[PDB]
Amino acid sequence: GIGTGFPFDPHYVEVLGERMHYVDVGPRDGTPVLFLHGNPTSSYVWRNIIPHVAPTHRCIAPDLIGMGKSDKPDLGYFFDDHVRFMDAFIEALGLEEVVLVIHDWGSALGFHWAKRNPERVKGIAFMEFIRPIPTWDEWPEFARETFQAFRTTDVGRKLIIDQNVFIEGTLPMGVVRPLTEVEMDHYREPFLNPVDREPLWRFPNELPIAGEPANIVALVEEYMDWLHQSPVPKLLFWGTPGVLIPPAEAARLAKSLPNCKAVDIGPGLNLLQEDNPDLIGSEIARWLSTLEI
Ligand SMILES: [Cl-]
């Protein structure tokens, strides 16, 4: 069965005055593979994928600021805050060239960093990634009213901050197979106190949906423009029915994005890592062996 444990030795680095935790396993030389999680997860979401890659490549998986075992400064936790912290995390570890493996808000961070630093990105593996959602009709109907309610300061904060719905509800509805109590407890751990749930509510308020927020839409459109032109090697995982990336969108992208290979993981919603970690891990490892790294 799918592993529930998190055996990785903790590492911490100081980044803009705050401590960030990260996983760091695998051989010291070579090009490192940088795994970036999204909302409402942490490096825990990569626990069953990293073991396929760590035999042959260094795997670095940070916890975003305010998440996982990272510190919880009093921020708004805008996407811009995550950009500043991830930029400085990357520099604090002295990373030069990397391969990215990215998901959800980690994908916005990784594509935005790669577009700004294309010489330092040797490949991107991505899944269930942030793209502009043109209208609410392109958000999955089964989740539409709740995401609309999340994007308010009254109902949305009641649900996500007071009641922890992003953890208790949205996270299971983003995984096809059932999550076990131990897994739920690993995801709950950083957010036991309601005040620490700020990032969980700011993230859905930052999603580029129906033109809002305009600044995030523009930034995401720009990295998608880059992705459609850049020769960077690309590996796209997708599932059925997906959430951010429906199967037809994935098929489009695989042919449209240069140097892109698509992998169907089977049934999946948003956290594809929880529905088929062994395929995702093994395919990343295989794909890495084809890159000039
Ligand atoms: Cl979100």
Author numbering: 3 to 295
Sentences from the paper on this structure:
The three most popular SLPs are HaloTag7 (HT7),14 SNAP-tag (SNAP),15 and CLIP-tag (CLIP)16. To guide the selection of an SLP–substrate pair and provide guidelines for the design of substrates, we report a systematic and comparative study of the labeling kinetics and substrate specificities of HaloTag7, SNAP-tag, and CLIP-tag. We complement these kinetic studies by reporting crystal structures of HT7 and SNAP covalently labeled with rhodamine-based fluorophores, providing a detailed understanding of their substrate preferences.
HT7 was engineered from a bacterial dehalogenase (DhaA from Rhodococcus sp.), an enzyme that can hydrolyze halogenated alkanes. In addition to the conventional α/β-hydrolase topology, HT7 features an extra capping domain made of six α-helices (Hlx4–9) that partially cover the catalytic site and form an entry channel for the CA substrate. After reaction, the PEG-alkane ligand is buried in the protein, while the xanthene moiety of the dye lays on the distorted α-helix 8 (Hlx8) in a conformation partially constrained by the crystal packing. The alkane-fluorophore is positioned by the Hlx6–turn–Hlx7–turn–Hlx8 motif of the HT7 capping domain from which T172Hlx8 and, to a lesser extent, T148Hlx6 form hydrogen bonds with the oxygen and the nitrogen of the amide bond linking PEG-alkane and fluorophore. CA-TMR and CA-CPY have similar conformations in both structures with only minor differences in their torsion angles. The direct comparison of SNAP and HT7 reveals that HT7 features significantly higher labeling rate constants with various fluorescent rhodamine derivatives. These differences in reactivity can be explained by specific interactions of the rhodamine’s xanthene ring with selected surface residues of HT7.
